[PDB]
Amino acid sequence: ARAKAKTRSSRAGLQFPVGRVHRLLRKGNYSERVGAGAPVYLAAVLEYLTAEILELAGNAARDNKKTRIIPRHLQLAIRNDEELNKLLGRVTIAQGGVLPNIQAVLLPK
Amino acid sequence: KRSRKESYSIYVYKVLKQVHPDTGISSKAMGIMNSFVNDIFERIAGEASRLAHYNKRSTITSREIQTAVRLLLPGELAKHAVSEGTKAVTKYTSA
């Protein structure tokens, strides 16, 4: 029986829902058995990637002097980073626009 | 009466409040971040499943998820996600 309980996220030191991650792993037909540390490790990785993207987007929003991160700032944050762009090379971001880029031969002089 | 839908909105928001206390977010950027989280979840999950199949294992372990991360994440993203996950797993084991 249950009692005054906790979260597995709190035990792992994570903000992401390790329990939900374990549920999705077990109901996703990824394998018959799902080890207990797998959703913890995966939630840690998911939180790390989300934190990196959100921090870069917040820096980009600050440089724009905006308070709230928007798809434009997410696009800027992702495209302006070599390996994050590599990871999201195939991905399209709605309302993200494109990086400002004009080829040198198109400029005057 | 009406049905419920799960998302990662609250956890993305808490991570946002941790990394940038004053910086907010928008509905559309939260949708994009939900999609990003789901996409990478699916990517590592699928790759770990294939690792288990290739190695004839019934179980997805933290070692399988680690190898999937090392395969899918380029460069220093791999190193830092491995460090984050290893720290989380060691903490969970100790607690």
């Epitope: 990196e52 921090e55 870069l56 302006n80 980073d81 070599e82 390996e83 990086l99 | 990394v19 460069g75 220093e76 993203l77 830092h80």
Partner: single-chain antibody, 227 residues
């Protein structure tokens, strides 16, 4: 408004096999983006701790870092003769990076090829190359650091070769200029209007675009002397 780095124990003396502890105070919250560097005399600084806790590659467990927010600490457990060096902290949580004042200790393959010493006259301009090898050039920023024997280490700026983005220290706008050549895997920093104040040893330093990644590999240093 620059983040002041405050190493409390400016100098310590210790014997072999005992413990030494160094502390660091910030002026604002930096959220654990702090690194520790060991610089032997006339040698390039080698990183020891990054993200305020993580051991760097090839660093033994004898070094331990701690702290977050504004109070940080470095610990060395089993001192050896080789440990005699000066240790700097470095915060990179805010755009102008700041090194610590330096703590002296006395005990009783990624390659960044850098140019040799250059003697130059005031008012001229100077361009120093960094030749990078052993790693994917475009994925990492190159960080340029100025070490005076009086003001300690100072951060000039970085260039990000993937899109040629740059950021400069407010003290160094105009003075320094950064350019990159992908084909030769070489980055140039140009100094304009040389002054006797500019007489310092400059280090190129590789740093990943990952926020928690620190200046990890350092060039041998190019001394610039202004008459």
């Amino acid at each position: 408004m620059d983040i002041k780095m405050t190493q409390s124990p400016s100098s310590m003396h210790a014997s072999l096999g005992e413990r030494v502890t160094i502390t660091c105070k910030a002026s604002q919250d930096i959220r654990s983006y702090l690194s520790w560097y060991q610089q032997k005399p006339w040698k390039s600084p080698k990183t020891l701790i990054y993200y305020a806790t993580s051991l760097a590659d090839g660093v033994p467990s004898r070094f331990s870092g701690s702290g977050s927010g504004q109070d940080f600490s470095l610990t060395i457990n089993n001192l050896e003769s080789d440990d005699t060096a000066t240790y700097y902290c470095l915060q990179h949580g805010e755009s102008p990076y700041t090194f610590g004042s330096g703590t002296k200790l006395e005990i009783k393959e990624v390659q960044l090829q850098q140019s040799g010493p250059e003697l130059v006259e005031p008012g001229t301009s100077v361009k120093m190359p960094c030749k990078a090898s052993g790693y994917t050039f475009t994925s990492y920023t190159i960080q340029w650091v100025k070490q005076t024997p009086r003001q300690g280490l100072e951060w000039i700026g970085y260039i990000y070769p993937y899109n040629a983005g740059t950021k400069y220290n407010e003290k160094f706008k105009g003075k320094a200029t950064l350019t990159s050549d992908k084909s030769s895997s070489t980055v140039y920093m140009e100094l304009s209007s040389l002054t006797s104040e500019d007489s310092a040893v400059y280090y190129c330093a590789r740093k990943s675009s990952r926020l928690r990644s620190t200046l990890d590999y350092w060039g041998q240093g190019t001394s610039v002397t202004v008459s």
